[PDB]
Amino acid sequence: GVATQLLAAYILLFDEYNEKKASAQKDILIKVLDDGITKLNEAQKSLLVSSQSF
Amino acid sequence: IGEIKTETETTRFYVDYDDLMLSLLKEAAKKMINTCNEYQKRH
């Protein structure tokens, strides 16, 4: 729900190049994608440990 | 509670553009006001 709106804001604001918001857009992208990789990996490890309990 | 946390995280990322007159952040804040008022009306 957060990623699908930040990426839509990225597609909206940079149809043409915006040099004033260019240094912050990269930080927002790095922050949200590094958050997502950690969350998805921990969700997979949790489901695996749950499957190994039967 | 997760429906509130998604909007809070989206607004927190829109603050990081360092533009307080950005219409996207104004609309996200106006959305969070209604979400918080509905949560207080339900409880």
From Swiss-Prot, chain B:
Family, per entry: Belongs to the hemolysin E family.
Physiological role: Toxin, which has some hemolytic activity towards mammalian cells. Acts by forming a pore-like structure upon contact with mammalian cells.
Post-translational modification: In outer membrane vesicles, the redox status prevents formation of the disulfide bond, leading to oligomerization and pore formation.
Top-level division of the source organism's lineage: Bacteria
Subcellular location: Secreted; Periplasm; Host cell membrane
Subunit annotation: Monomer and oligomer. In periplasm, it is present as a monomer, while in outer membrane vesicles, it oligomerizes to form a pore structure that is active. The pore is formed by a dodecamer.
Protein name: Hemolysin E, chromosomal
Induction note: During anaerobic growth. Weakly or not expressed in most strains. It is activated by SlyA, while it is silenced by H-NS. Its expression is also regulated by CRP and FNR.
